[PDB]
Amino acid sequence: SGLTHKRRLSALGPGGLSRERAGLEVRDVHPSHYGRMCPIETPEGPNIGLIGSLSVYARVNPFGFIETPYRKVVDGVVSDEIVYLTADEEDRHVVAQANSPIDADGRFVEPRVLVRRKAGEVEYVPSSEVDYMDVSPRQMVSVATAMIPFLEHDDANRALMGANMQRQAVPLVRSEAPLVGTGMELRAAIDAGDVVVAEESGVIEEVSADYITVMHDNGTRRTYRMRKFARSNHGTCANQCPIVDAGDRVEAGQVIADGPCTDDGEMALGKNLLVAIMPWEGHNYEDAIILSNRLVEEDVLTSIHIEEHEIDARDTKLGAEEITRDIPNISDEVLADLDERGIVRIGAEVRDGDILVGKVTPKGREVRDTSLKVPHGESGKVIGIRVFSREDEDELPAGVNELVRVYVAQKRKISDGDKLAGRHGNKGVIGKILPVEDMPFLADGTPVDIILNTHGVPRRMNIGQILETHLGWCAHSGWKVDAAKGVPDWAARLPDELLEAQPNAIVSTPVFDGAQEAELQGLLSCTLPNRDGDVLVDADGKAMLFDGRSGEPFPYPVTVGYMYIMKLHHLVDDKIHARSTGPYSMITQQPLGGKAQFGGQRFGEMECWAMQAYGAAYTLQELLTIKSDDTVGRVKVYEAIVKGENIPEPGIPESFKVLLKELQSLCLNVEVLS
Amino acid sequence: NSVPGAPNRVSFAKLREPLEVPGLLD
Amino acid sequence: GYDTPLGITNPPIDELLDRVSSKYALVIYAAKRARQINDYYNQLGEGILEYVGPLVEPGLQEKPLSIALREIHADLLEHTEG
Amino acid sequence: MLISQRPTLSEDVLTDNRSQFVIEPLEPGFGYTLGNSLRRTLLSSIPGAAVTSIRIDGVLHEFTTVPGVKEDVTEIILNLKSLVVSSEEDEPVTMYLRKQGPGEVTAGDIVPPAGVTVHNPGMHIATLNDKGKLEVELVVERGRGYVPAVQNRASGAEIGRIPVDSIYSPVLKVTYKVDATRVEQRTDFDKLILDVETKNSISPRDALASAGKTLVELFGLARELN
Amino acid sequence: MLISQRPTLSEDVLTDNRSQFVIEPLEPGFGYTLGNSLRRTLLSSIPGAAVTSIRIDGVLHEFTTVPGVKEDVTEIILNLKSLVVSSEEDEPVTMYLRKQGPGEVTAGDIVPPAGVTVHNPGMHIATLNDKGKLEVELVVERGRGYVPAVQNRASGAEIGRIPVDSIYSPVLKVTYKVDATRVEQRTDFDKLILDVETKNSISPRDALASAGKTLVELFGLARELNVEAEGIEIGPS
Amino acid sequence: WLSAASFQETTRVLTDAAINCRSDKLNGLKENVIIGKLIPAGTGINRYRNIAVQPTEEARAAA
Amino acid sequence: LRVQGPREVQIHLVREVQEVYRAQGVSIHDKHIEVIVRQMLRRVTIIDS
Amino acid sequence: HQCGLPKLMALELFKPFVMKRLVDLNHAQNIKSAKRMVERQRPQVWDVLEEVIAEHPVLLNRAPTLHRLGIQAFEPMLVEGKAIQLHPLVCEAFNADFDGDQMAVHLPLSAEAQAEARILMLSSNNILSPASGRPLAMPRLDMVTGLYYLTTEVPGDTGEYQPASGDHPETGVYSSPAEAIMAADRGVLSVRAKIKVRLTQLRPPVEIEAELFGHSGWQPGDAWMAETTLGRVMFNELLPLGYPFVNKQMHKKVQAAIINDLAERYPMIVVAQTVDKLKDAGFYWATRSGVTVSMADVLVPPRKKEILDHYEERADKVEKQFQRGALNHDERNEALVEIWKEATDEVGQALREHYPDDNPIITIVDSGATGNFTQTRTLAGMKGLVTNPKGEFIPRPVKSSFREGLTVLEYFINTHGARKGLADTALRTADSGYLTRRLVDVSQDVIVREHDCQTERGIVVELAERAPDGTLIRDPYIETSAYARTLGTDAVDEAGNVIVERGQDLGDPEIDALLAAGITQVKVRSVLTCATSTGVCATCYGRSMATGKLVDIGEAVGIVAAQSIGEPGTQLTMRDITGGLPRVQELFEARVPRGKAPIADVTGRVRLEDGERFYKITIVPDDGG
RNA sequence: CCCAAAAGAAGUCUUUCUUUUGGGUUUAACCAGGAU
Ligand SMILES: [Mg+2]
Ligand SMILES: [Zn+2]
């Protein structure tokens, strides 16, 4: 998220068009964007088109125009002279394609090759007029979109939601590198800056969970400190742990400590889960998802979140504000946790309704106890306090003495309402976490750990995921192309040292030059047995599953594989909310809004037309009179309800009297005749 | 690749890219 | 041929609509009867008043409105429109 | 045409922690169901023992860093969740792990009291470089199935106590197959081959016996109608 | 260990032979563990008897119609198939049904030898017209489950004999469901609901008891390995 | 003038209504929503809003 | 409306709106559009006081 | 009629009711103690909570609430977790998917507010869309696929019916569905195999019933022989008892027809129970249908290359003609567009021919579950032409299918047109609300006030104009102009007696009888001619589309019409003559159209002079004025 | 309407009744970022 936020181009701001005043001619993708602004990555809301991401290879020239590299061809010979061109020069010349048949001597195989003319036309020009060629494929895709495997099989519409749902993952407690990546993880991780990189070559002296000592080659020594459980701007942990031992030797630029979402220097936003593609009992109906319970017991998906609470003892004109322990008119039990100063001891579970700070300010005893309490809906241990004091000559805000600040942390497991989602854009909300015994399990007893619907794949045109699934399995089980008597034809161009892989072998398929379909068929045709001489996935890639709930085998084979799915930051615990009676506004007596204060839902404008259309009148009257702003109606209905009486009649709404006063303020003699 | 201690991640790529990716925060 | 309606769906709505002109009349009918029954329950220990009922056997905790509807089905009440 | 045989069960030992039980001859169609019933009972309702809570020297909460260990304290908790304990007492017991000095710290160092016995010495707990000391106290307890963290406040406890999730499941992996014989003369039967694999806490025979007892209890409930 | 809440078994009689047993709170994994097993045990483990094959005079090659009888061969076959008969002799016994003159044959017209009995004597089988005659031989033996028609083992042994399907089990249909039943800080328990329908030879109650016995025997065979093993217990009745 | 004022062109509607001294008879569905009174449609109309329920005489006798 | 009278304009509006909706395969019963068209044609303009 | 509620929300919405019941049961001496109990969640509050919410309706709403069915009243039941559980058969009414949607819960309090949440807004009492009368609680997606798999007859399957061979009698004849199920459980019979059974609990079809029983009916208990698949018997066992036997493959249209007929001829409760049972069967069977997607199931046409080369030759010839000056730029572009359109159609046809009939993709597409054939062509055969930012087709065109993988340039020119789709979606969903608001505000005072105005005016309906050679071809769009009306006059044909009397609902039987009699035009009542001073009458408005009976005397028809003419506003695309949402806006607004077309004023012949830069027309009046 | 503190009385080993004081809007407007 940070790396993509630094490379952003926004067309809205001081001196630029506005979100509500942009036509449909500025949000499109002009044919001059090729290689200068990714056409896939873009927000989905009303900003679509006004915000974009700079491509991988682009640079900004001194005047501020965006330039891209091109490899120049002289006399049909593809040299290596890289020339940076802006839009105009690219317009003037003719440019070929990156993935063209080079004959190993910088010469095209056939005279005709796709090119881009002046105005973005695509045509066939003989291989004698070509003036430039793309340095490589992928040149049009930004950093986020370059990390989607099999991108060229997915429609743009779903690749967009795939590139906008990698910036919303959540650093899990333990991270794991994906089985099938795209070779772009390493560079993104190292550049994003969340990992620690040895500044100079040397040998490790001592390693510990807090710091690492490197003894450079020439006397000097350096100590790298580590961020342990530090809050980020959006409430996720920021751990860092070493990956080197006390005797290893490091080199300049080497990765020496993981980050929030890194695993040995590679981006790791999620986990590899065993996935089947059958519809199951309707629980995964309409994009829903089903998880096994193994993803709860073993903390496969378990996030850590940290909340910050602040309070300032203002000097005030009256003076004497102090953070004291003794809370006026308080019980002994509720004051038990607080330390001598009046700050909760670090290591106590402050569930909703406890004290964190004891603050009393003059009434203008004559004081008000604004003792900061855990707001509604929080819990978890207290992992860190920080108190700044005026007496310690700190840089405090003018007119205060103390700024005690507390942190509370909690581990959230996966549960109903979360928003798991793959990479290609197969978002869903966990529907039912079944126990580990009734899950479709393969012939050898391994239970599948997730289930996806078939009806969602073909219609949305994101077939890519299925391909990934297949490849995932080939990565997990490990294969061995049998070159006993000549290499098979489908593996002729397969690179060396890829004819065979050990189990749990990681592979990479670049975005636009990857694994062809024939290669996938060949790999699936040969795969090692698991423990005994059994193969669980036949050539088509589909296995035979036993139904755990009833016992009988499913009549037809099903697709199974390994897919890399994440956990999005739209958890349920931050969304659920209810209100019986709580705070009310001041100018108008309606209830407030938002989960923080207490909040009550809004019965909007076009939710009073449905009630009118139904013909229900009493419900509408009570939803607008004795539930929102009739001052006596509220207390009377509360009393009637607790005492079992029949609910009373409504009066008139306060906002109407506010309207009458506002009209009268304009010199309009409004009067309520009879 | 070129990072001294990166994990060995094999690739299916057929082409070769003459130019390394520039500094992503440059 | 209703199988065995359970809960808020019992009795069937069609047989109730048989008793009145339109669902709108049935709404107010049932609401007024429920209010009368609730007043009787709150006043049962106090002095007697005209309001009577329930005309059917009360359940364990059957909420007032439900009972009212059950009565409309048995044809034990009559109404007049405005 | 009533078959004149009563089902019989035999065992084959593939290794210490795996076995294959063969049950035959069953009625046609009654192999998959029986296998699935035994599998369901095996994987959810076998009692075992596990660690419930731990206390480490210099850690009030569980998001800190003990001085001298390469890993954090959360990592030590995750690594201590793979232990395979087998207790015999029905009340909480206590275990102590003590180390001081350079080197590794494995489960094997754990000193169990009479009764409980760590069954896989050597897994990995944590590494100590030069100046670290690990003096940790564990609480083994019996149970069944799964039990989320026993909240510290709800169950009276101190401030240095770290609740840990418990998994009292000895059975690791179960499967089955059926060898149906559909002859032309309609004298049919199945033959259930059920494969069990436990995590070295209890031999598979005992897991099968416990499942048998539970199912006998329930279907005996079913029987006593008249 | 202890289960902490005993299950219960209650029955809601619907017809003379049809019930709906309810097994209330089970631990939240056993809604299906004993549902499917009990269903299969009910359907395919209760001994019974049925007609294995028949021979009808005058029908040797053409199986379209029987002279002197209103109904075609298949109608007679599938009328005799659903005949409730109870037997004790293990060997296949033989019965003869013969009637002359116009009228309406009925299951009570058969003369059973010792041991074999018919539980629905008043069943229509065939009709005779114009001084017609019917004479059919049945062979009855006791089996288990549902055994499709068995083709001839020795064709030369008999030519008129034609095999038919055998519905040995006295239980005809069974189904089951599950729900959720508790408000005690855990709304995730299971309530099993069976639906047993049986012929006029065994009331559903006895069928359920017999199924229970068989399952107890099998899982006791399972338990026999280690008698003193720790497992869940429900306690006394 | 209340409904028109709440729909669009609030300033113009208010000013011309003020000039003409229009008196708004309260009928419709938007103004009765504004002033918190029963809409004159659906269950709110007079025919169904003044129904009179009363136990039958046979039931009264049986009690 | 000025040429063929009110009935013609009513049928014209209904047919045009229904054509627009049908072209996209959406079914709307005509009485709704007739209600709206009734609401449009309510007033009259004065030519001679 | 049930919805899940997480018990932590239920404990909060029903707080006062819980406190009262706690006090009554002597679990707390006064109100404050009960409040403390509820705040601290003692183990007993739950026991009373479940008793409080029993039969207490709760309103569920989703935003935006486009049309009337956006707010529905359910009955709450406690569930574990933190997510509201919703019934799958209402997702279409709310237009709610499960990709992270959020829904709001309101609670009615007074006695009236509860009554209006059990008789007007209960979920099971709104099964028919108010706009057009089609059902909205119909099975969809997985359910349709499951049922389509269930009621299919695959030739030559296991246990198929086999006529007598002369040595053994007939095989595949079963004496009751119980025996068929017992055999199916043994693997000897397949749920989709044709067999002959002896049914006694299903009513036979019309023809079989007439030609076998006659008399009055089948009188449940009488037995008849049926040749069908066990699956179709299972399905017909879900429909009500009196419904005839439906022996057909259940394509989505057929299920829609069946549900519509049930709603027409039965009360609403039976329809609700039937849709519930259909849901259960559909979900149970969709799991066994074996509908999975794997790249071995996405077959490619066998001869794509030959076709592509053949049309590439034509493109080459057109380009060479352009280079020699035979035609300008636009002519070349048009010719190439035509050639490539033909190539796309040919590849699509070959792809349609190649696939078998049981492939998962074509099983999903053809069964009406979801999708159309265009997406399958895009997935397997060839994408075809793509659009420029302006809107003109790129003459390249794309030539690779998403299975084979596009190249770089093709992907770019695809995103070109892909983005404008999202842009227009956003802007049109923004616009539609404005139109809905104006329509609601114009037609908010049309309320049914009287029962019958007793007028005689009315409109005339086309009603299946006569054929040229002589025949009554039904007007295709009759379901939206002649059903659910009330005749104003009587229908008389060829001096015959009145076929339909004045004031009749004019349903399917009436229209069928009218066409059989041989009349093409009828005069029906309409709100356009209603004679009540304020609001429309009841007979003039006619049948209420949602209820199925004559509208009531308090309904607010105006708002229903406003919402129905504005809910299908997202579907209607925004595509110099306007032809999308702008056309509707400029129609209702009564603006002068963008491109006006001067219509004639008076009959006669017309003289046209084709002047320079503009035409000139003159109307010759027959009158001569 | 509701909560907190102090005193008196009754019983229970902790609830009810009486009197005094204190009290209740985490409001609000902007800009920004997200969801369907
Ligand atoms: Mg959604
Ligand atoms: Zn009228």
CATH number of the domain within which H196 lies: 1.10.274.100
The residues in C 38-57 lying below 8 A from F, measured between CB atoms, are: 52-53, 55
Q: Which residues of F fall within a CB distance of 8 Å from H556?
A: 29, 41-42
Interface G-H, measured as beta-carbon pairs within 8 A, has a size of 95
Q: Residue D127: how many CA atoms within 13 Å on its side-chain side?
A: 12
Q: How was this structure determined?
A: cryo-EM
Q: Which residues of F fall within a CB distance of 8 Å from C78?
A: 53-54, 56
Which residues in 344-373 of chain A line strand I, with CB less than 7 A from it? none
The answer to whether H186 faces chain D, any CB pair under 8 Å, is yes
The residues, any chain, with a CB within 8 Å of residue A604's CB and separated by 6 or more, are H63, H65
The residues, any chain, with a CB within 8 Å of residue H158's CB and separated by 6 or more, are H187, H188, H189, H190, H193
Q: Secondary structure of chain B: what % helix, strand, coil (to 5)? A: 0, 10, 90
Give yes or no for a contact between H6 and H84, defined as CB atoms under 8 angstroms apart: yes
Q: Counting Cβ atoms within 10 Å, is residue A648 exposed (0-12), middle (13-18) or buried (19+)?
A: middle
- Centre of ligand 2 to C-alpha H509, Å, is 25
Full domain range(s) for residue H356: 295-424
- Any strand I atom closer than 7 Å to A570 CB: yes
Q: Do H269 and C65 touch (CB under 8 A)?
A: no
Q: Tokens at residue A574, please?
A: 């931050």
> What gap in Å lies between CA D85 and CA D200, rounded to an integer?
9
Closest residue by C-alpha to C1' distance, nucleotide I24:
A583
- Centre of ligand 2 to C-alpha G32, Å, is 15
Task: Give the bridge partners for E190, in sequence order.
Answer: E26
Could you tell me whether strands A211-216 and A221-225 are parallel, antiparallel, or unpaired per DSSP bridges? antiparallel
**String of b and e for H131-166 (b: at least 16 CB within 10 Å)?**
bbbebbbbbbbbbbbbbbbbbbbeeeeebbeeeeee
> What gap in Å lies between CA C2 and CA H240, rounded to an integer?
9
Query: Which ligand neighbours the alpha carbon of H527 most closely?
Result: 2
Taking the CA of residue H165 and the nearest CA in chain E, the distance in Å comes to: 10
Q: Counting Cβ atoms within 10 Å, is residue A463 exposed (0-12), middle (13-18) or buried (19+)?
A: buried
Q: Secondary structure of chain F: what % helix, strand, coil (to 5)? A: 55, 5, 40
Residue of chain H minimizing CA distance to D27: H186
Which residues in 501-540 of chain H line strand I, with CB less than 7 A from it? none
Are residues H245 and H339 part of one domain?
no
Residue H101 known to bind ligand = yes
Sequence-ordered strand ranges (E) for chain C: 77-80
Interface of chain A toward chain C, CB-CB under 8 angstroms? 615, 618, 644-646
Residue in A457, A467, A470, A449 with CA at minimum distance from that of residue H360: A457
The answer to whether A604 faces chain H, any CB pair under 8 Å, is yes
Q: Do H416 and A29 touch (CB under 8 A)?
A: yes
Among the partner-chain residues H116, H441, H444, the one whose CB lies closest to the CB of F43 is H116
> What gap in Å lies between CA A22 and CA A50, rounded to an integer?
9
> What gap in Å lies between CA A16 and CA A18, rounded to an integer?
7
* CB count in 10 Å sphere of residue D53: 19
Pick the CATH number of E47-167 from 1.20.1090.10, 2.170.120.12, 3.40.50.300, 2.30.30.40: 2.170.120.12
The answer to whether A670 faces chain F, any CB pair under 8 Å, is no
Are residues H363 and H273 part of one domain?
no
Q: Do C8 and H55 touch (CB under 8 A)?
A: yes
> What gap in Å lies between CA A608 and CA A589, rounded to an integer?
20
Helix (H) / strand (E) containing H441: helix H408-442
Helix axes H408-442, H581-588, angle to 10 degrees: 20
Q: Do D225 and E219 touch (CB under 8 A)?
A: no
- Any strand I atom closer than 7 Å to A631 CB: no
The answer to whether H556 faces chain F, any CB pair under 8 Å, is yes
CA angle D77, D81, D86 (to 5 degrees): 135
Give yes or no for a contact between A615 and H555, defined as CB atoms under 8 angstroms apart: yes
Which residues in 231-270 of chain A line strand I, with CB less than 7 A from it? none
What one-character DSSP code corresponds to residue E126? E
Residue H3 known to bind ligand = no
- Centre of ligand 1 to C-alpha A596, Å, is 25
> What gap in Å lies between CA H625 and CA H618, rounded to an integer?
13
The answer to whether E67 faces chain A, any CB pair under 8 Å, is no
Phi then psi for residue A624, to 5 deg, are -110, -5
The residues, any chain, with a CB within 8 Å of residue A326's CB and separated by 6 or more, are A335, A358
DSSP H252-296: HHHHHHHHHHHHHHS-HHHHHHHHHHHHHHHHHHHTTT-----TT
* CB count in 10 Å sphere of residue A156: 22
Among the partner-chain residues H67, H97, H279, the one whose CB lies closest to the CB of A287 is H97
Task: Give the bridge partners for E22, in sequence order.
Answer: E10, E193
Are residues H414 and H366 part of one domain?
yes
- Any strand I atom closer than 7 Å to A654 CB: no
Sign of CA dihedral C6, C7, C12, C13: negative
Helix axes D32-42, D204-223, angle to 10 degrees: 110
Q: Counting Cβ atoms within 10 Å, is residue H532 exposed (0-12), middle (13-18) or buried (19+)?
A: middle
Query: Which ligand neighbours the alpha carbon of A161 most closely?
Result: 1
The residues, any chain, with a CB within 8 Å of residue F21's CB and separated by 6 or more, are none
> What gap in Å lies between CA D87 and CA D141, rounded to an integer?
7
> What gap in Å lies between CA D9 and CA D196, rounded to an integer?
14
- Any strand I atom closer than 7 Å to H30 CB: yes
Touching D: which chains, 3+ CB pairs < 8 A? A, E, H
Are residues H240 and H216 part of one domain?
yes
Sequence-ordered strand ranges (E) for chain E: 9-11, 18-19, 21-26, 48-56, 85-86, 93-100, 103-106, 117-118, 124-128, 133-143, 146-147, 162-163, 166-167, 171-179, 190-198
- Centre of ligand 1 to C-alpha H96, Å, is 6
Those nucleotides of strand I lying less than 7 Å from any protein Cβ are: 1-5, 15-17, 24-28, 32-36
**String of b and e for D70-95 (b: at least 16 CB within 10 Å)?**
bbbbbbbbbebbebbbbbeeeeebeb
Q: Tokens at residue C61, please?
A: 């905790």
Resolution at which this structure was determined, Å: 3.7
Q: Do A191 and B23 touch (CB under 8 A)?
A: yes
Q: What is the CATH number of domain D47-168?
A: 2.170.120.12
Sign of CA dihedral E112, E117, E121, E126: negative
Q: What is the CATH number of the domain that holds H399?
A: 1.10.132.30
Give Dmax over CA atoms of chain H in angstroms: 103
Taking the CA of residue E172 and the nearest CA in chain H, the distance in Å comes to: 6
Residue H453 known to bind ligand = yes
The answer to whether B20 faces chain A, any CB pair under 8 Å, is no
The answer to whether H116 faces chain F, any CB pair under 8 Å, is yes
Residues recorded for chain D: 226
Closest residue by C-alpha to C1' distance, nucleotide I23:
A368
Q: Tokens 């068995």 identify what position?
A: E150
Q: Do H175 and E81 touch (CB under 8 A)?
A: yes
Give yes or no for a contact between H551 and H557, defined as CB atoms under 8 angstroms apart: yes
Are residues H273 and H335 part of one domain?
no
Could you tell me whether strands E9-11 and E21-26 are parallel, antiparallel, or unpaired per DSSP bridges? antiparallel
Interatomic CA–C1' length for residue A332 and nucleotide I22, angstroms:
21
> What gap in Å lies between CA E58 and CA E56, rounded to an integer?
6
> What gap in Å lies between CA H612 and CA H597, rounded to an integer?
19
> What gap in Å lies between CA A556 and CA A543, rounded to an integer?
9
